[PDB]
């Protein structure tokens, strides 16, 4: 398969040197191959056809210089040739949509843009629920979390039902779809396919997202992801490079 | 004193008569007189000179119809004559800045606009610390929380230092100052004024904000705030109307 983004780039850990300045005409993304928050930014870069380079950060052995890129020490972080730094996944995505030409991902209409950001807050509980599920130590907690997924997924189903459209912002894929897609991308890998069996519009949306050329170009092995996940929970410095 | 931002409106609770229609050319804000998040929205409405009506919600006796304005059941909520509903304080502020004429509060530059949103994230721990502080009942826990305030205020002082500006978005007042002002406005009332003494530029920004005409027009009694707070902590249905 053709390696996209920074799918083959080994991560930078403790003792790595700070990278050199970003070349003129390019934008750098500090990312992690399996981070859903950094995937939002990689999806936008691909969709808009922005020339970019990827540096992967070993999130379980972070270089001290990374905290100079983002004081929170989290990926994604964008860095341009002027040395400007942009962090927070949603801020990185909105910045790229505004600063570069190509397909316009967010609507200009103030209310429509506000709707995409309100849908993002309707989704906000999913990332921590995904977190609690992966760290689940017994069958009782495990089963209850599946019911929570169904409850949160129903709120998204309601948005699609009212909008009477395939995607969260209309007939075509827009910003909001790319912002929430990295968590749905892993549902099958997490064995959570049953959580969408009472949300038919969201299940059709997932199928339609899998067919998008940008989405499709970034898909990776479900087994590299489970393998990564096992090591990440063990706080392994080898987690972020699993499969390389 | 002269009320120009819903200071005189008794809150609507369970059983109360819901409001009429929103007049054409005006916008409604569902608010609460002492809510710092809804205050961000009131500051933006006043600064831009937007015709608006304030409806206060009794947060400790919430009408069930309010959940149809915002499924989260929180203020602020904007509602126009077309029936569009906008919620989440930061979303309500950006929407008003984009949709209406008057003074521009957010910068035109994509990076400068991204900086405002990253500074809001650097401030994001302050509301939860304020929550914990007001609930503190131990001398050790009281002193400990003050050290955390000092550390969060230092992150804000560093932004002002690096920028060499009076305000968080330049040498003139802008969106970001209004978004964080409602918490600093109350430090004196909470007996936390001394927590800003180690952050000189932050203390001068507080003085400068106090002199802004928009900030000054929304001035309230420190004692009304304190009295409201005691009752709010007791989950009293009389809290939101304190002073009326």
Contacts of B155 in chain A (CB under 8 A): 71
**Residue of A88, A98, A114 lying closest to B86 (CB–CB):** A114
Number of Cβ within 10 Å of residue B188's Cβ equals: 14
The reply to whether residue B87 touches residue A118, judged by beta carbons under 8 angstroms, is yes
* A77 sits in which H/E element: strand A77-80
A113·B122 Cβ contact <8 A: no
Kindly list the strands in the beta sheet with B52-56, ordered across the sheet, starting from the edge strand earlier in the chain: B52-56, B27-31, B77-80, B85-87
Q: Report the alpha-carbon distance of residue A106 to residue B111 in Å, rounded.
A: 17
Which chain A residues contact residue B84 at CB under 8 A? 111
What experiment produced this structure? Answer: X-ray
Q: What is the C-alpha to C-alpha distance for residues A92 and B164, in angstroms, rounded to an integer?
A: 25
- Name the binding residues of B for glutathione: 62, 75, 88-89
> What are the backbone angles phi and psi of residue A145, rounded to the nearest 5°?
-65, -35
Nearest by CB to B99, which of A86, A95, A110? Answer: A110
Structural domains of chain A, ranges and CATH numbers in brackets: 1-105+221-244 (3.40.30.10), 106-220 (1.20.1050.10)
Cα dihedral B210, B30, B45, B174 in deg (nearest 10): 60
Do A114 and B122 lie within an 8 Å CB cutoff? no
- Is residue B239 a contact partner of residue B13, using CB atoms and an 8 Å limit? no
Question: Residues of B forming the annotated binding site?
Answer: 62, 75, 88-89
Using DSSP bridges, classify how beta strands B27-31 and B52-56 pair: parallel, antiparallel or unpaired.
parallel
The label of the residue with tokens 């599920």 reads A133
Among candidate residues B35, B93, B195, B240, the one labeled active-site is B35
Q: Which of B84, B88, B117 sits opposite A88 (nearest CB)?
A: B117
Residues of chain B with Cβ-Cβ distance to A117 below 8 Å are: 88, 91
Neighbours of B233 (CB within 10 A): 11
In B24-183, which ranges are E strands?
27-31, 52-56, 77-80, 85-87
In terms of CA atoms, which chain A residue is nearest residue B80? A111
Structural contact between residues A201 and A155, judged by C-beta atoms closer than 8 angstroms: no
Binding-site residues of A for glutathione, please? 62, 75, 88-89
Closest by Cα among A175, A95, A113 to B95 = A113
Size of interface A-B (CB pairs under 8 A): 51
What is the distance between the alpha carbons of residues A133 and A135, in angstroms, rounded to a whole number? 6
Query: Contact B33/B56 with Cβ under 8 angstroms?
Result: yes
**Chain B contacts to A (CB-CB under 8 A):** 71-72, 84, 86-88, 91, 94-95, 98-99, 110-111, 113-114, 117-118, 121-122, 155
Q: Are A210 and A218 spatial neighbours (Cβ–Cβ below 8 Å)? A: no
Judged by phi (left if over 0) then psi (alpha if -120 to 50, else beta), residue A52 lies in beta
The answer to whether B86 contacts A121, with C-beta atoms less than 8 Å apart, is no
CB contacts, 8 Å: A71 with chain B: 122, 155
Q: Do B117 and A71 touch (CB under 8 A)?
A: no
Residues 6+ apart with CB under 8 A from B175: B44, B93, B94, B97, B105, B106, B116, B169
Kindly report the nearest CA distance between residue B155 and chain A, in angstroms. Answer: 9
Which of A118, A94, A107 has its CA nearest to residue B92? A118
* Contacts of A150 by beta carbon, 8 Å cutoff, 6+ apart: A195, A198, A199
Q: How far apart are CA B181 and CA B169, in angstroms?
A: 13
For A121, name the nearest residue in chain B, comparing CA atoms only. Answer: B88
Q: Do B60 and B237 form a contact (C-beta atoms < 8 A)?
A: yes
Closest CA to A192 of A222, A231, A155: A222
Burial of A167 (0-12, 13-18, 19+ CB in 10 A): middle
CB of A37 closer than 8 Å to CB of A76: yes
Long-range contacts of B68-75 (CB under 8 A, 24+ apart): B69/B30, B70/B30, B71/A122, B71/A155, B72/A121, B74/B37, B75/B30, B75/B31, B75/B32, B75/B35, B75/B37, B75/B38
* A198 bridge partner residues: none
If you measure CA to CA, which chain B residue comes closest to A116?
Answer: B91
Q: How far is A110 from chain B (nearest CA, A)?
A: 6
Query: Which of B95, B114, B155 faces A114 most closely, judged by CB atoms?
Result: B95
Alpha-carbon gap, residue A187 to A202, rounded angstroms: 12
Separation CA A222–CA A210 (nearest Å): 14
With H, G, I as helix, E, B as strand and everything else as coil, classify residue A225.
Answer: helix
Query: Facing residues of A87 across strands?
Result: A77
Dihedral (Cα; A12, A18, A20, A22), 10-degree rounding: 70
Q: Residue A110: which of B72, B95, B122 has the nearest Cβ?
A: B95
* Set of chain B residues whose Cβ sits within 8 Å of the Cβ of A151: none
Cis peptide before A76 (omega within 30 of 0): yes
Cα atoms in the Cβ-side hemisphere of radius 13 Å centred on A43 = 30
> Cα distance from A227 to chain B (closest Cα, Å)?
32
Q: Let me know if A93 is a catalytic residue.
A: no
**Minimal C-alpha gap between B237 and chain A (Å):** 28
Residues A79 and A94 sit within 8 Å (Cβ to Cβ): no
| Cβ atoms B61, B117 nearer than 8 A | no
CA of B128 to nearest chain A CA: how many angstroms apart?
Answer: 17
């Amino acid at each position: 398969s053709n390696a996209m983004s920074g799918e083959s780039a080994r991560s930078l850990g403790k003792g790595s040197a700070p990278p050199g300045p970003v070349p003129e005409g390019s934008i750098r993304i500090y990312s992690m191959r399996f981070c859903p928050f950094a995937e939002r930014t990689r999806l936008v870069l691909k969709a808009k056809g922005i020339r970019h380079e990827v540096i992967n950060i070993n999130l379980k052995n972070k270089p001290e210089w990374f905290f100079k890129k983002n004081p929170f020490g989290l990926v994604p972080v964008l860095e341009n040739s002027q040395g400007q730094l942009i962090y927070e996944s949603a801020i990185t995505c909105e910045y790229l949509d505004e600063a570069y030409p190509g397909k316009k991902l967010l609507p200009d209409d103030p209310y429509e843009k506000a709707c995409q950001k309100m849908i993002l807050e309707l989704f906000s509980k999913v990332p921590s629920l995904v977190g609690s599920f992966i760290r689940s130590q017994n069958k009782e907690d495990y089963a209850g979390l599946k019911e929570e997924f169904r409850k949160e997924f129903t709120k998204l189903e309601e948005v699609l039902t009212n909008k009477k459209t395939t995607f969260f912002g209309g007939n075509s894929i827009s910003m909001i779809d790319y912002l929430i897609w990295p968590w749905f991308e892993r549902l099958e890998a997490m064995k959570l396919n049953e959580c969408v069996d009472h949300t038919p519009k969201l299940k059709l949306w997932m199928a339609a997202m899998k067919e998008d050329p940008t989405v499709s170009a970034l898909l990776t092995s479900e087994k590299d992801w489970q393998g990564f996940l096992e090591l990440y929970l063990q706080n392994s410095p080898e987690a972020c490079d699993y499969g390389l």
